[PDB]
Each structure stands twice: as structure tokens, then as C-alpha cells.
Design a protein around this ligand. Structure first.
Ligand SMILES: *[C@@H]1O[C@H](CO)[C@@H](O[C@@H]2O[C@H](CO)[C@@H](O[C@@H]3O[C@H](CO[C@H]4O[C@H](CO)[C@@H](O)[C@H](O)[C@@H]4O)[C@@H](O)[C@H](O)[C@@H]3O[C@@H]3OC[C@@H](O)[C@H](O)[C@H]3O)[C@H](O)[C@H]2NC(C)=O)[C@H](O)[C@H]1NC(C)=O
Ligand SMILES: *[C@@H]1O[C@H](CO)[C@@H](O[C@@H]2O[C@H](CO)[C@@H](O[C@@H]3O[C@H](CO[C@H]4O[C@H](CO)[C@@H](O)[C@H](O)[C@@H]4O)[C@@H](O)[C@H](O)[C@@H]3O[C@@H]3OC[C@@H](O)[C@H](O)[C@H]3O)[C@H](O)[C@H]2NC(C)=O)[C@H](O)[C@H]1NC(C)=O
Ligand SMILES: *[C@@H]1O[C@H](CO)[C@@H](O[C@@H]2O[C@H](CO)[C@@H](O[C@@H]3O[C@H](CO[C@H]4O[C@H](CO)[C@@H](O)[C@H](O)[C@@H]4O)[C@@H](O)[C@H](O)[C@@H]3O[C@@H]3OC[C@@H](O)[C@H](O)[C@H]3O)[C@H](O)[C@H]2NC(C)=O)[C@H](O)[C@H]1NC(C)=O
Ligand SMILES: *[C@@H]1O[C@H](CO)[C@@H](O[C@@H]2O[C@H](CO)[C@@H](O)[C@H](O)[C@H]2NC(C)=O)[C@H](O)[C@H]1NC(C)=O
Ligand SMILES: *[C@@H]1O[C@H](CO)[C@@H](O[C@@H]2O[C@H](CO)[C@@H](O)[C@H](O)[C@H]2NC(C)=O)[C@H](O)[C@H]1NC(C)=O
Ligand SMILES: *[C@@H]1O[C@H](CO)[C@@H](O[C@@H]2O[C@H](CO)[C@@H](O)[C@H](O)[C@H]2NC(C)=O)[C@H](O)[C@H]1NC(C)=O
Ligand SMILES: C[C@@H]1O[C@@H](O)[C@@H](O)[C@H](O)[C@@H]1O
Ligand SMILES: C[C@@H]1O[C@@H](O)[C@@H](O)[C@H](O)[C@@H]1O
Ligand SMILES: C[C@@H]1O[C@@H](O)[C@@H](O)[C@H](O)[C@@H]1O
Lengths: 153, 153, 153
């Protein structure tokens, strides 16, 4: 509830969609075909369990995992919506952060809500800022996530 | 955390389901067939990007958009569940509100949670009240949404 | 925001998946086949309207209902993710609690966030702890849910 947060993390989320042939490498999978509302994959719904790394390499030792879903939701351009949990299980942090909101893909930056937390993040609340770092067609993307907590207990 | 909220909005959400033949007019689409648990569409899951208007006309200039999903979830009557973001991008408001909860369709009024907000709505929390204004078969519905924020920063 | 909560409930949630042939007994249904990312049902997505009971008997008089969804989300073992509403409509409690987070099935205990509440639970926030009480193959499971509110208005 102010400018500077009480806890700030910056790290990278990676998504490697299952393509029918890459079980070992994939971190996510679409569960439905898009219904066909426009040409930007409206309604394509993806469940993921992806790594959170401090650098841009999806093979780096993860500091957390992101588990949840996203879907595309715009008829005339790409737009998406997310709800997920960051799961920490390291000597450094043990706990979870729950996040949801609109991933406005057409914007240079966009904010989602940190709606709760557990463990070391008990009762957290704040903002999760997304910036796109890289996308490669429909096969891979990497998001820089900046977690800014404004309630820290 | 009291009777009167610190910010109160009242406006209308519109949903025009994709029917296979109305790409230009539709605002939402079902992504699955209902599995068949009863006759009230249990499990039908809809993603939407619909207009929020100050009057009851779905063609009015929107003051915001609602992006997210709903699904039906009752075996013996209609009931639904929502999670979505109200996205404001006007000279008046720029920001988002994140909302989720049970849309108890059989009740004259029902409340969902405002679980967070961003931008001009940074760290908002409160209640979103739904009343049904009109439904037309399975083709269209309009909900009056009353947003009552009880934390305003 | 402390050790002892301001309100604590402990009760059992029951899930009886629709199997194609048990409409009257089922409380939930999968809406998609799993896409095939591993052998632990990654991406299987289930919508539910199940009873909340004070004892372990799914036929006991419910004290509330749980309405929402879960999905499985791990490639190499079982893991799940939940978002739902506890709906109270008794002489004792009338209101709702909104809950979401990672149901870390491989852990003896795990915590989800109580992100909001309505009615008698207006503006609640806290933690929902899950422990598995029983699972029977893929047909039935029972979770002991411990609701710990840390903001009570
Ligand atoms: C697990 O999944 C990941 C993600 O999909 C796999 O990694 C991806 O692998 C592909 C190849 O299969 C790779 O694409 C190739 O990239 C090289 C390098 O491109 C970069 O460097 C160039 C300079 O050397 C630069 O000029 C480029 O702009 C890039 O920065 C290209 O030279 C190749 O042509 C190829 O590029 C692809 O070519 C086809 C085209 O359709 C496509 O758009 C284009 O991307 C990805 O870069 C790589 N991604 C990442 C994030 O590493 C990985 O192999 C999988 N692992 C297993 C075991 O399967
Ligand atoms: C985009 O989607 C919207 C929403 O689906 C489309 O608007 C809907 O269009 C239908 C016609 O296709 C229209 O239904 C018709 O309504 C008139 C008017 O009914 C009202 O006024 C009457 C008094 O004049 C009153 O007596 C009625 O009770 C209503 O208040 C009816 O006279 C027609 O018979 C028709 O009604 C439908 O008839 C068939 C029946 O199955 C159905 O239940 C019934 O609704 C909708 O009213 C209209 N909805 C809205 C919200 O405007 C719109 O055309 C689409 N646009 C494009 C470009 O495709
Ligand atoms: C609504 O759905 C519920 C949930 O699916 C149905 O209840 C389930 O019904 C099955 C039978 O269809 C029942 O399974 C049977 O359980 C008995 C009893 O087992 C317990 O007690 C034994 C001691 O008496 C103990 O030794 C066991 O370890 C158990 O504690 C078994 O003896 C049967 O063999 C059968 O067990 C099943 O056998 C096949 C095997 O594949 C399976 O894994 C195993 O479970 C469930 O226990 C019962 N569940 C609950 C929670 O009550 C109910 O009938 C449905 N109602 C309607 C109207 O259809
Ligand atoms: C968190 O990390 C711990 C450390 O490995 C995991 O638990 C240990 O898990 C291994 C299996 O990988 C067991 O063999 C050990 O007995 C566990 N040790 C203890 C002290 O519990 C745990 O499963 C991880 N939890 C996650 C990833 O959710
Ligand atoms: C919010 O509204 C602005 C105003 O149009 C959008 O951005 C402008 O977007 C147009 C494309 O429609 C660009 O051509 C302009 O260059 C943009 N201007 C500026 C100053 O950025 C923006 O995309 C909208 N965001 C939404 C709807 O999420
Ligand atoms: C909550 O419980 C009440 C009590 O039954 C439900 O409403 C009554 O609902 C019955 C239908 O079962 C109607 O015939 C009565 O007229 C209702 N009475 C009043 C005073 O409203 C209500 O539908 C339930 N709501 C839920 C389960 O969401
Ligand atoms: C960087 C990429 O990593 C993976 C491999 O399968 C690709 O060939 C490429 O090497
Ligand atoms: C009000 C409705 O708007 C749309 C049209 O396609 C219908 O015919 C009707 O006019
Ligand atoms: C306990 C179980 O309840 C239900 C019945 O259909 C089963 O046969 C069993 O009795």
C-alpha cells in the first residue's frame, strides 16, 4: 500500500508447450483446441508446471516452480489470462504465492495480483509484474516476473 | 471492512456466446461440451472478453472490459462460478480489478470477492455483487455488477 | 497475521467423479481427457459441487458445499491445483469463502489461500490446509480441510 514494496523478487518463468512428441522437455500442455473465435487462439487453455530461474536459461537450477494455468482470450489479437502458484521448496524459501490476473500481451508491462501466500509467504499480498522476455512461435516463451509484496507478515 | 464502501461502481456486463456462425458479434466461447452430469450444462466452461457498459445496451461505448471465464456447476439446476479481471483503459481509469467466486444463479443477489487490483486500483479488496438483468436462452445474458471496494489505497 | 486464527473450521470435502454411469451419485466431472503429458493425468480438469461434512461420511447432512474446480498438473507424479468457493446456507452460517492454490498431493500437509469471503465471511482472509483422508483409486476422495481465518470483520 505504497511505492516501495516490503519484498521484491525478479526472476524468469519458462513455458515449453507439449507438441505431441516432447514429453520429457515439455512443461505445459493445452487441454482443448481453440473453439475458433478469431485467429489468435481464443479459448486455448494451458496447464503448466514450469521452472522459475534467476537467469534466462530454462535449464538453470530452479529457485521455484510455477503451477497453474493460462488461456488466450482475445478475438483480434493475442491476449491471455493467468492464475497460478509460485511454489518455493529450497533451503532459502519454503512456501507459496498465489497470483491471478490479466496478462495484457499487447502492453510493454502489465500487472497481476498477488492474492495470498503460505509458509514463508504467509498472508502475502501484492503485485506481480510481467514483461515478455522472449517468445519463439508457439513452442516456447519466457516471462520476466517481478514480485512486489506490500503486505509482509 | 464496514457497511459503506470506499469506492462503488455499478455497470452491466454482456455475454454473447459464440454459436459457430457469429465470430464478429460473439464475446465469449465455450471450450468444452458439457460432460453430461445432469441437464443443466454442468462443466460447460466459457472464456470471455466482454464489454462493461453504463447502460443496458451491449453496443454502448464500453467503460471497461471483463476478461476471464465462467462455468456451470450444478447437476439439478443452473449455477455458475466466475473468475475474471475488469480491465480499465480510459482517460478516467487505468488499471484492473481481479474477481472470483460463486455466481449463485438461483439467488436474487449474490456476492463474489474482489481479491486484488492494479494501476488505479492498486491493492483493492472488496465485494462484487451480481444481479441478473436479462438472459435470452443460451445466446445472451447481461449481469448488473456492483463493485464495492472496502480497501482503497 | 499471527499464530492463532480468529476463526477455525475443520471439516471434510468429498469428491465422487462422474464415470459415465453414476449421474445421481456423482459430485464432479472431468471436462477434458488428459493430453498425455506423462502418466499422472496432467491436465485432467474437474469441476465439482461437493458436500462438506463434519464427519467422514459423504452421506452426512452437509454443513456447506464446495463449488469450483481442480486439475492435475505434474508429469512424473500426482499433483493438483484448486480454486473454489465454500458456500454456507444454514441457520448457523450464510456466506461464502473463496480459496485457491496448489494442492501438493505428495506432501503430508499443504496450504492454500483464503482470498476473500462474503456474507457472514465478509472480507475474510486466511489459509486453508488440506490433508488427504482417503482416496479410492480414481473414483472417490476425501480431504480434511482446516480453514484458518486471520482477518475477521
Ligand atoms: C526443449 O525445448 C526448447 C524450446 O523449444 C528447445 O530449444 C529450442 O530449440 C530450437 C531448435 O529446436 C531453437 O531454435 C533454433 O535456434 C537457433 C539459434 O537461434 C538463436 O541464435 C542465433 C544466433 O546463433 C540467432 O541468430 C537467432 O535469432 C536465435 O537467437 C537457430 O539458428 C535455429 O534456426 C533454430 O531456430 C528456430 O528455427 C526455426 C524457426 O521456425 C524458429 O522460429 C526458430 O526459433 C531454439 O532457439 C531453442 N530455444 C531455447 C529457448 O533454447 C530445446 O531444444 C528442447 N530440448 C529438447 C531436449 O528437445
Ligand atoms: C449480436 O448478438 C445479439 C444477442 O444475441 C443479437 O441481438 C439479439 O437478436 C435477437 C434476434 O436475432 C433478438 O431476439 C428478437 O427480439 C425481438 C424483440 O424482443 C423484444 O422486444 C419485444 C417488443 O418489441 C418484446 O415483446 C420481447 O419480449 C423482447 O423484449 C423479438 O420480437 C424477436 O422474436 C426475437 O426474439 C427472439 O425470438 C426467438 C426466441 O427463441 C428468442 O428467445 C427471442 O429472444 C434479441 O432480442 C437480441 N438481443 C439483444 C440483447 O439485443 C444481435 O442481433 C447480434 N448482432 C449481430 C450483428 O448478429
Ligand atoms: C457413490 O460413490 C461411492 C464412492 O465411490 C460408492 O461407495 C464406494 O462403493 C464401493 C463399492 O462400489 C466401495 O468399495 C468396496 O469397499 C468394501 C469395503 O472396504 C472397506 O472396508 C473393508 C472392511 O469391511 C476394508 O477391508 C477395506 O479396506 C475398506 O476399508 C470392499 O470390501 C469392496 O471390495 C469394495 O472395495 C473396492 O473393491 C474394488 C477395488 O478396486 C476398490 O479399490 C475398492 O475400493 C467403497 O468403499 C465405497 N466408498 C465409500 C467412500 O463409501 C457408493 O456405493 C456410491 N453410491 C451409489 C448409490 O452408487
Ligand atoms: C520438497 O523438497 C523435499 C526435499 O527432497 C522433498 O522431500 C524429501 O523428498 C524425497 C523425495 O524426493 C524423500 O525421499 C525424502 O524422504 C523427503 N525428505 C523429507 C525430510 O521430507 C519434498 O517432497 C519436496 N516437496 C515438493 C517439491 O513439493
Ligand atoms: C489502451 O489504450 C491505448 C490507446 O489506444 C492503446 O495504445 C495505443 O494503442 C494504439 C493501438 O490501438 C497504438 O497505435 C498507440 O501507439 C498506443 N499509444 C500509446 C501512447 O501507447 C493500448 O494498446 C490499450 N491497451 C489495452 C486495450 O490493453
Ligand atoms: C438456501 O436455502 C434456502 C432455504 O431453502 C433456499 O431458498 C428457499 O428455497 C426454496 C427452494 O428450495 C424456495 O421454495 C423458498 O421459497 C426459498 N425461501 C426463501 C425464504 O428464499 C435457497 O435457494 C438456498 N440457496 C442456495 C442453496 O444457494
Ligand atoms: C538449444 C536447443 O536445445 C534443445 C535441442 O534439442 C535443440 O537442438 C537446441 O540445441
Ligand atoms: C437487436 C438485434 O441486433 C442484432 C440483429 O442481428 C438482430 O436482427 C436484431 O436486430
Ligand atoms: C458403501 C457403498 O455405497 C454405495 C453402494 O452402491 C456400494 O455398493 C456400497 O454399499
Amino acid at each position: 500500500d505504497q511505492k516501495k514494496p516490503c519484498k521484491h523478487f525478479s526472476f524468469y518463468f519458462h513455458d515449453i508447450l507439449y507438441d505431441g512428441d516432447n514429453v520429457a522437455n515439455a512443461t505445459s500442455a493445452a487441454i482443448v483446441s481453440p473453439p475458433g473465435l478469431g485467429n489468435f487462439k481464443f479459448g486455448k487453455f494451458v496447464i503448466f508446471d514450469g521452472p522459475i530461474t534467476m537467469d534466462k536459461n530454462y535449464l538453470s537450477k530452479p529457485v521455484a516452480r510455477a503451477q497453474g494455468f493460462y488461456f488466450y482470450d482475445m478475438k483480434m489479437d493475442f491476449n491471455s489470462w493467468f492464475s497460478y502458484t509460485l511454489v518455493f521448496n529450497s533451503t532459502e524459501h519454503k512456501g507459496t504465492l498465489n497470483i491471478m490476473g490479466a496478462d495484457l500481451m499487447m502492453e510493454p508491462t502489465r500487472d497481476l495480483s498477488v492474492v495470498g501466500g503460505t509458509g514463508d509467504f504467509f498472508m502475502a499480498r501484492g503485485i506481480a509484474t510481467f514483461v515478455t522476455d522472449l517468445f519463439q512461435g508457439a513452442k516456447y516463451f519466457r516471462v520476466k516476473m517481478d514480485i512486489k509484496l506490500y503486505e509482509c507478515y
